[PDB]
Design a protein around this ligand. Structure first.
Ligand code: DGD
Ligand code: CLA
Ligand code: CLA
Ligand code: CLA
Ligand code: CLA
Ligand code: CLA
Ligand code: CLA
Ligand code: PHO
Ligand code: BCR
Ligand code: BCR
Ligand code: BCR
Lengths: 137, 34, 442, 81, 341, 334, 36
């Protein structure tokens, strides 16, 4: 098996347009994800709130949908709760809160796409392990 | 007036020779990427 | 007498070559302090907490109040550079003194000068060297007092507002406080001198120790040791090396416990949270999360019948539940706002938790000082991803190992000093075996 | 003490290092090539990073028959063709 | 003076590495066991027998590299290269685990060869053959663990695989499935090994600190002469010391050095017996009295019942990946777990 | 003739069947206290709430244990590292429930054992011996300090110190592996190397000396009677042993100096055990064994499991099951 | 005959191990078996 464009291809938006990442982008996003996100989201879980994960099906049911590049890039700017009703930038890393979350400061806009892409590709590769937890280690 | 090839010669090279070959293969291996 | 592998014991009575060894080794120490810092600074990234970066020396400099402002945010990197360079430069001068005295300078000092030369058994000369070094040590401790009071202060994790650099205007001079630390139990909730939790006590103790050291330094210059001391000790170079090996060993064990428990002179902003702290932060985090969801954390009975979030310590104080019950002695700037006099206050918990406390707890919980030897972060069953081992684990473990081996070194050299002094370190005289002139046991 | 040539005497000898400064790198290179050429994979049957699973496969290709096992891993290998 | 006697001559010549008749068995078999292990650990996978990577070539390091046991489906097949499994194909033979039988059998004949060498050299030199006899303990461990144990099981698959982490896995398996720590034959082994290490250290230390002063130097090593008649340390002072520190001491050097042979050898033999029981799942798994009380009295808890909870966790969590041929599918909800974790 | 000088003479006398000494002055009461308390608790202590969760674990014989399952249970997680003498308890009933005996026993034992090491130095000096046997014993002593004191200090609780019992021991070593992957820790590996090598060299040296005894006896008597206590000649032929062992391997892998040999005998196990004692002492501060979980992945990024991942699966089953009622939140950070 | 001083042989062999084992440790962080 290998890192083919079918796997590197993920939804851009809710409309259904798609985007094909490059290998470089995927590894870029994987690296960036370890830098800014893995301390809480290692393997697609959320250690400070295990009830919410980064599985694609979970992101699909977030309000607004987050199973796509647009929704994830937005979330990294203005993160909300799962039903959309309150902005949680004060307690979640995001560009809007890079003052309090200094790691987010040097994240450019393409960095955000590579992070979002990593998140959407990894479940296609790792399967249930992505966001499944220790049961699947 | 020493012998060159001995039983000793042979046990040494029985080990030393493939050790190096092996070290070369394991060296090449550090540059394999997925 | 000595083989190549004990060859440094050839310098015992060669005072000039042995000075060379000491000063050249002092060079190695300054070199590493300088080189390591420059390595750390060259690899430092300010956006990232220091404790995600493998830093052990930059944290020591920040603590002195250089390079940082409120929150521990790094403002200026040049103080770090300066510290590196000057240590690195200085080591060439100590290197130079070292190699000269070891190779070219007089093998023995006592003929070039009756001041620098010494005999190990000259109890007067030895106590005088002691005194000079005590005074030096004394000055050194005041240097820290001076910084704190007259040159910019020290970083204060307890500063109102998230921590900041503060000048200490009222050092604690009361000896009931300073010395009270030295009589507290080393056990939990007491912690002997490891529990010092404010910079006033830190600065005041250094006033005392500087004074005491200067005083004792003068003492030992003017006196020779008294008879009860002359008869209780072995007077030789190896014997004195043994005495200091023991002291270093003890200090090393203390340091281990200091960096593991204390979040005042090792602020968590720089060093990462302590074990206890991280464990408290986890209970805080889910307490926060669950109460936002509607849970009544005060009234929530857990599996065992003990409160799921909140319970009582053995002396009644309200504390975090779960296994962290063992950590209720923890105090930290992010937690104390919640403490009333019965312990954690249910009403402050319901009403007064702030985003910054939430954030700090989430961060410390996910930066607990657990990791693998190859720096995979988290519990030992965790998968690869997070490259991280807390500075506190690196400093705790390294110094336990050294403290231990210096204790072995103490026993090795103390035992040997005794036997060389009594004259049987090389074995039993066959013609006069002590046991053979002793009566049989039975 | 048994009549072979002392080891210390051999490895400081000029003649020794004249041969072995060739024979050691040649063997080190031989081994390199064994790997860099891919021959080691084929000799031993060791999977390459792209040929543990077929693309959409997560079944291990686990041998399950004693006397048909040769035909089994042969089948799994074609499920990569 | 026939050919047999001429060859005996040549085999038994005093040379840097003595050959002997036993060298004919030892040397090929020892070299092939070791070659097979270095060969497999460098190049050969465990993908088809185990679903594991196991060689440097695959990305494994020194701790995780192993020569893994054959697939369970191979039963206790010899897995001869020319046999009906690999039908002469060296590549398939590697992929089916043939190197494991190779290593184990050539290793077995090498240990025999090695102990034959101990007998051979001791006869030629004129010493008693107690070092050979001692070596019987490592043979017993080897056969019982690598041969007998899997022969009582379903396949070689369940023998130890030749590797650092693979052996660690073997240890943990024996805790979770056999509760091997509870077994008095392992305990007697533990006391033999630990007792051995103790004796080793305590005897070395005593000699070095009851030395006679025979040279002028601070380095006491120089003052021994291999041909000296005299004891180089005082047994008398050693004996008084240990009698006063510990109450009893050795007084007989011969007993002492025999006891040093006896303790670790016996320890190993005892553990071999217990592994032989485990060949049959004949375990010291439980205490019946404890289970009966605990079934009836849910406030009754001991370290004995705590540890079985951990074995239950081990079995359920490791079985599906550790025995892939069984196709164990354990849905999340059947996995035993304590609270929260 | 003065009273105190006569007392000092008796304390340090080489004529006492058992040496006392100044270290003896502390060791004897501390070890009596620890031995007496332990013996009573093993037989009769009631159950102890080791984990602070009001789930007492029965450790003594009269409460349904045997020799294999009984233990003096560690003190309550509720106490942590707090000192818990008897007189800090409302009553012995409280002290027993919360596991007071453990602390009493381990503190007296570690003192008494520390003084045992010192006592080894002291008699060595009174007898004109070289001094370092006590250094050999520092290795087991360090080990005991690791599991009774150091590991508790870093984890924050004596409830995680090693139980004083056979199955409690096993419990401690299974949990240690779940939480620290000690098998994959180099310092534990050096321990095994030091313990296995120790046993090997015990056998080797015993078998080689035994092999080369000089005939002094007949076939109808123990060979041991060929040595008489305090005889001045050696009782085996070390050149014969060298000649056999050097030929078993090769000449230069065999010792011909009995001093270097016996120092090698001493150092190998001592150092291995120093390291394994240090392993425990540093896993106390959670610098754990190597972690290669998911270290090997394929071209697509599938995880290719190794033996490390199998180890992990076992560790996970230990993790999730141990102290099954004690954890309310998802990470077991100590 | 005995030309190369033994101490030179030892240092060069010495640094040759250092070098090769350094490569193996570097390989733990790069390529296969690196977690990446
Ligand atoms: C000369 C001969 C010596 C003879 C002396 C004999 C008497 C002393 C015996 C010492 C026993 C030590 C037990 C340690 C218990 C423990 O809680 O020890 C740790 C204590 C620190 O205590 C902790 O101290 C903490 C202080 O932090 C507090 O204050 C901090 C201030 O910022 C923070 O706010 C933190 O959150 C807050 O909790 C708390 O009080 C904790 O509850 C408390 O556990 O360390 C300290 O007292 C430091 C000293 C302990 C050293 C222990 C090392 C032992 C080394 C053994 C070596 C053996 C080698 C084997 C040889 C073979
Ligand atoms: C004595 C205290 C001490 C402590 C606590 C640390 C701790 C640290 N150093 Mg520093 N370091 C030290 C001494 C120390 N070092 C010395 C003496 C040197 C010169 C060689 C360095 C050179 C150095 C470099 C070059 C780097 C570090 C790095 C690091 C970090 C990761 C360590 C690691 O993975 O090692 C792995 C563990 C081992 C190698 C184990 C050693 C085991 C020994 C051999 C057994 C000891 C037996 C007895 C002594 C950590 C913060 C790295 C980092 O993150 O930089 C920011 C890094 O790149 N350090
Ligand atoms: C911190 C480490 C340290 C230090 C400072 C010393 C220092 C010393 N040793 Mg010890 N030694 C050490 C470690 C150390 N040793 C170790 C680890 C071993 C075990 C292998 C030994 C074994 C040993 C033996 C066997 C003997 C000594 C002796 C000596 C003394 C004289 C050596 C001499 O004449 O050199 C001669 C060497 C040279 C001329 C070679 C050049 C050495 C220079 C210093 C290299 C420095 C290079 C540096 C990069 C340049 C910087 C220059 C700049 C600062 C200007 C000297 C005080 C000797 C002694 O006691 O004499 C009575 C002796 O017999 N040592
Ligand atoms: C503690 C370390 C130490 C000690 C005890 C000695 C002792 C000695 N040295 Mg050595 N030396 C040292 C360090 C030391 N030196 C260093 C670091 C260097 C390199 C700079 C040298 C370079 C050196 C040379 C080149 C020579 C000696 C010589 C001598 C002897 C005569 C010195 C004399 O009369 O000076 C008398 C007093 C002075 C020179 C006053 C100097 C004032 C100093 C520099 C100020 C001290 C400030 C402070 C303590 C240092 C810290 C600053 C830093 C933290 C920023 C004497 C035995 C001589 C000798 O034996 O020749 C045969 C000789 O020629 N030394
Ligand atoms: C490096 C530091 C150092 C060293 C090595 C020495 C060394 C010495 N001192 Mg000096 N001393 C020092 C610093 C030092 N001193 C300072 C700073 C002062 C000023 C306060 C003094 C004041 C001083 C006086 C007034 C005297 C000495 C004397 C002596 C000699 C006897 C030492 C002795 O028997 O102590 C052994 C100590 C004891 C037997 C009793 C100590 C009991 C304490 C409580 C033990 C605590 C240990 C515990 C584990 C740690 C916890 C601490 C506790 C408070 C909680 C010896 C040469 C004597 C001498 O002959 O002078 C000429 C003497 O009369 N010293
Ligand atoms: C201030 C510290 C100090 C000082 C000044 C001394 C001084 C001395 N010791 Mg003591 N010793 C100490 C600490 C100290 N020791 C400690 C902490 C221990 C505990 C292990 C000992 C144990 C000890 C023993 C057992 C003996 C001495 C001896 C000696 C004498 C000669 C030693 C020698 O030449 O070493 C030469 C140096 C070497 C042979 C090299 C050793 C290197 C170590 C073992 C390896 C460390 C490697 C490193 C951590 C990782 C490698 C990384 C890689 C990339 C390079 C000398 C008087 C000897 C003695 O009594 O004579 C009087 C002796 O027999 N020492
Ligand atoms: C000398 C020691 C020695 C020993 C004891 C063994 C033992 C073994 N090897 Mg190993 N082997 C050796 C040397 C040795 N080997 C050498 C030097 C090589 C390099 C080529 C190998 C390569 C090797 C491989 C590649 C394999 C083995 C295997 C085996 C096993 C099966 C052997 C078998 O069934 O034999 C059967 C044959 C005999 C027992 C010979 C009996 C002699 C008969 C009675 C005489 C017949 C003479 C004939 C009738 C006269 C002429 C007839 C006419 C045509 C003219 C066994 C454990 C296999 C294994 O481990 O599988 C897991 C395997 O695959 N060996
Ligand atoms: C893991 C522990 C362990 C090892 C590695 C070990 C090793 C050894 N012991 C020997 C001897 C002894 N061992 C003895 C007692 C003991 N030995 C013990 C434990 C061990 N002994 C214990 C605890 C005791 C106490 C009773 C005695 C009394 C002797 C000796 O007389 C002898 C000696 O000379 O010691 C100095 C040597 C036999 C050499 C040989 O047969 O050459 C020939 C090599 C052959 C035949 C190849 C065997 C192939 C093996 C069995 C299978 C393959 C192994 C792989 C290649 C490597 C696997 C590595 C992974 C598992 C990690 C060898 C150095
Ligand atoms: C005696 C002896 C010994 C020892 C030795 C020693 C220990 C030495 C020392 C030495 C030393 C201790 C050295 C030092 C050096 C120093 C130097 C020489 C420095 C340099 C620096 C510089 C020049 C700088 C530069 C810079 C700057 C300024 C800035 C930043 C960057 C840089 C870095 C570039 C031995 C063991 C061998 C042996 C025997 C004898
Ligand atoms: C700074 C500081 C502080 C303070 C501190 C101090 C001030 C300290 C002190 C300390 C001290 C004050 C110490 C001391 C010590 C002591 C010791 C350590 C001793 C020892 C002893 C010995 C060792 C002895 C011995 C002997 C005997 C017993 C008998 C006879 C013989 C002899 C002599 C040998 C505080 C915390 C506040 C805070 C922070 C900072
Ligand atoms: C199986 C088989 C066979 C055989 C094989 C062989 C015989 C092999 C060999 C092989 C070999 C014979 C190999 C070797 C190699 C080795 C190696 C690969 C080594 C490595 C080393 C190392 C890396 C080390 C290092 C180090 C360290 C780390 C530390 C200490 C020091 C030293 C330097 C040691 C045949 C053909 C019959 C066919 C059938 C199959």
């Amino acid at each position: 098996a290998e890192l083919t464009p079918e796997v590197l291809t993920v939804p851009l938006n809710s409309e259904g347009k798609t985007i094909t990442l490059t290998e470089k982008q995927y590894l870029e996003g994987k690296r960036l994800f370890q830098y800014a996100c893995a301390s809480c989201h290692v393997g697609g879980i959320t250690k400070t709130n295990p009830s919410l994960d980064l599985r694609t099906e979970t992101l699909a049911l977030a309000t607004p949908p987050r199973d796509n590049i647009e929704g994830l890039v937005d979330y990294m700017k203005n993160p909300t709760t799962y039903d959309g009703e309150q902005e949680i930038a004060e307690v979640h890393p995001s560009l809007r809160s890079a003052d309090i979350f200094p790691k987010m400061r040097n994240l450019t806009e393409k960095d955000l796409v590579a992070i979002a892409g990593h998140i959407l590709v990894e479940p296609k590769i790792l399967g249930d392990k992505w966001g499944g937890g220790k049961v699947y280690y | 007036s020493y012998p060159i090839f001995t039983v000793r010669w042979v046990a040494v090279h029985t080990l030393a020779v493939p050790t190096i070959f092996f070290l070369g293969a394991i060296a090449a291996m550090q540059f394999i990427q997925r | 007498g000595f083989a190549w592998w004990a060859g440094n014991a050839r310098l015992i009575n060669l005072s000039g070559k042995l000075l060379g060894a000491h000063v050249a080794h002092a060079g190695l120490i300054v070199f590493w302090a300088g080189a390591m810092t420059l390595f750390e600074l060259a690899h430092f990234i300010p956006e990232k907490p220091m404790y995600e970066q493998g830093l052990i020396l930059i944290p020591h400099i920040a603590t002195l109040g250089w390079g940082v402002g409120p929150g521990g945010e790094v403002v200026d990197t040049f103080p770090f550079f300066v510290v590196g360079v000057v240590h690195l430069i200085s080591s060439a001068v100590l290197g130079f003194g070292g190699v000269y005295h070891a190779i070219r300078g007089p093998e023995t000092l006592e003929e070039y000068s009756s001041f620098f030369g010494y005999d190990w058994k000259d109890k007067n000369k030895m106590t005088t060297i002691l005194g000079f070094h005590l005074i030096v040590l004394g000055i050194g401790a005041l240097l820290l007092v001076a910084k704190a009071m007259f040159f910019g202060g020290l970083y204060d994790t307890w500063a109102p507002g998230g921590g900041d650099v503060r000048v200490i205007t009222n050092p604690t001079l009361d000896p009931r406080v300073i010395f009270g630390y030295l009589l507290k139990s080393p056990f939990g909730g007491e912690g002997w001198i490891v529990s010092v939790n404010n910079l006033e006590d830190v600065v005041g103790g250094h006033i005392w120790i500087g004074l005491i050291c200067i005083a004792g330094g003068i003492w030992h210059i003017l006196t020779t040791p008294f008879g009860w001391a002359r008869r209780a000790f072995i007077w030789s170079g190896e014997a004195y090396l043994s005495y200091s090996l023991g002291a270093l060993s003890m200090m090393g064990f203390i340091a281990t416990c200091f960096v593991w428990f204390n979040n005042t002179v090792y602020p968590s902003e720089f060093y990462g949270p302590t074990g206890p702290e991280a464990s408290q932060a986890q209970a805080m985090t889910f307490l926060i999360r669950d109460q936002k969801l509607g849970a009544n954390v005060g009234s929530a009975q857990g599996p065992t019948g003990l409160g799921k979030y909140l319970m009582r310590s053995p002396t009644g104080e309200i504390i975090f539940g779960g296994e962290t019950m063992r950590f209720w002695d923890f105090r930290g700037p992010w937690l104390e706002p919640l403490r009333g006099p019965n312990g954690l206050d249910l009403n402050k918990i319901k009403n007064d938790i702030q985003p910054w406390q939430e954030r700090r707890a989430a961060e410390y919980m996910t930066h607990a000082p657990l990791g693998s030897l190859n720096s995979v972060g988290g519990v030992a069953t965790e998968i690869n991803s997070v490259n991280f081992v807390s500075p506190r684990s690196w400093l705790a473990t390294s110094h336990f190992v050294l403290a231990f081996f210096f204790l072995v070194g103490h026993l090795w050299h103390a035992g040997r000093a005794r036997a060389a002094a009594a004259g049987f370190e090389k074995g039993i005289d066959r013609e006069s075996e002590p046991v053979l002139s002793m009566p049989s046991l039975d | 003490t048994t009549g072979e040539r002392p080891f210390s005497d051999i490895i400081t000898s000029v003649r020794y290092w004249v041969i072995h400064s060739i024979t050691i790198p040649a063997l080190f290179i031989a081994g390199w090539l064994f790997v860099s050429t891919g021959l080691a994979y084929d000799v031993f049957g060791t999977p390459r990073p792209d040929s543990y699973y077929a693309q959409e496969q997560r079944s291990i290709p686990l041998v399950t028959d004693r006397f048909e096992a040769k035909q089994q891993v042969e089948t799994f290998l074609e499920q990569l063709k | 003076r026939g050919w047999f006697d001429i060859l005996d001559d040549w085999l038994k010549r005093d040379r840097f590495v003595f050959v002997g008749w036993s060298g004919i068995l030892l040397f090929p078999c020892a070299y092939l066991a070791l070659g097979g292990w270095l060969t497999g650990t460098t190049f050969v996978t465990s993908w088809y027998t185990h679903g594991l990577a196991s060689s440097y070539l695959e990305g494994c390091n020194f701790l995780t590299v192993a020569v893994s046991t054959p697939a369970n489906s191979m039963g206790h097949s010899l897995l001869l290269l020319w046999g009906p499994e690999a039908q002469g194909d060296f590549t398939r033979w590697c992929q089916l685990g043939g190197l494991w039988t190779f290593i184990a059998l050539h290793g077995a004949f090498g240990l025999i060869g090695f102990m034959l060498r101990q007998f051979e050299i001791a006869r030629l030199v004129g010493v008693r053959p107690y070092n050979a006899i001692a070596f019987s303990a490592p043979i017993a461990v080897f056969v019982s663990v690598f041969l007998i144990y899997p022969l009582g099981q379903s396949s070689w698959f369940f023998a130890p695989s030749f590797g650092v982490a693979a052996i660690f896995r073997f240890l943990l398996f024996f805790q979770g499935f056999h509760n091997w720590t509870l077994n008095p034959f392992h305990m007697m082994g533990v006391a033999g090994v630990l007792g051995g290490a103790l004796l080793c250290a305590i005897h070395g230390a005593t000699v070095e600190n009851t030395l006679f002063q025979d040279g002028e130097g601070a380095s006491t090593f120089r003052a021994f002469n291999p041909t000296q008649a005299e004891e180089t340390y005082s047994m008398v002072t050693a004996n008084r010391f240990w009698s006063q520190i510990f109450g009893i001491a050795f007084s007989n050097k011969r007993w002492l050095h025999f006891f040093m042979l006896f303790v670790p050898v016996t320890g190993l033999w005892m553990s071999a017996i217990g592994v032989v029981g485990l060949a049959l799942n004949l375990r010291s798994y439980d205490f019946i009295s404890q289970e009966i009380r605990a079934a009836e009295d849910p406030e009754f808890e001991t370290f004995y019942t705590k540890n079985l909870l951990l074995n239950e966790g081990i079995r359920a969590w490791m079985a599906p990946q550790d025995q892939p041929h069984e196709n164990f599918v354990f849905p999340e909800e059947v996995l035993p777990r304590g609270n929260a974790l | 003739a003065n009273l105190w000088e006569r007392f000092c003479n008796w304390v340090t006398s080489t004529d006492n069947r058992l040496y006392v000494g100044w270290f003896g002055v502390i060791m004897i009461p501390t070890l009596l206290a620890a031995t007496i308390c332990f013996v009573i608790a093993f037989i009769a202590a009631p159950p102890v709430d080791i984990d602070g969760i009001r789930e007492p674990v029965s450790g003594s014989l009269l409460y349904g244990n045997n020799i294999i399952t009984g233990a003096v249970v560690p003190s309550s997680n509720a106490i942590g590292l707090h000192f818990y003498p008897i007189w800090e308890a409302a009553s012995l009933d409280e002290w027993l429930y919360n596991g007071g005996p453990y602390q009493l026993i381990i503190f007296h034992f570690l003192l008494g054992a520390s003084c045992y090491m010192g006592r080894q130095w002291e008699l060595s000096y009174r007898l004109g011996m070289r001094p370092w046997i006590c250094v050999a014993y520092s290795a087991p002593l360090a080990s005991a300090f690791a599991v009774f004191l150091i590991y508790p200090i870093g984890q924050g609780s004596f409830s995680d110190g090693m139980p004083l019992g056979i199955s409690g021991t096993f419990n401690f070593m299974i949990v240690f592996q779940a939480e620290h992957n000690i098998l994959m820790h180099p310092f534990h590996q050096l321990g095994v190397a030091g313990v296995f090598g120790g046993a090997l060299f015990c056998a080797m040296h015993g078998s080689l000396v035994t092999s080369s005894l000089i005939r002094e006896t007949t076939e109808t008597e123990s060979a041991n009677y060929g040595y008489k206590f305090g005889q001045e000649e050696e009782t085996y032929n070390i050149v014969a042993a060298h000649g056999y062992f050097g030929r078993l391997i090769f000449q230069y892998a065999s010792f011909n100096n009995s001093r270097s040999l016996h120092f090698f005998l001493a150092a190998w196990p001592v150092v291995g055990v120093w390291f394994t004692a240090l392993g425990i002492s540093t896993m106390a501060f959670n610098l754990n064994g190597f972690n290669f979980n998911h270290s090997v992945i394929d071209a697509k990024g599938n995880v290719i499991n190794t033996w490390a991942d199998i180890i992990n699966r076992a560790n996970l089953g230990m993790e999730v099951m141990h102290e099954r009622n004690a954890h309310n939140f998802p990470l077991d950070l100590a | 005959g005995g030309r190369i001083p033994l101490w030179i042989v030892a240092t060069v062999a010495g640094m040759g191990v250092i070098v090769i084992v350094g490569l193996f440790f570097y390989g733990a962080y790069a390529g296969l078996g690196s977690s990446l």
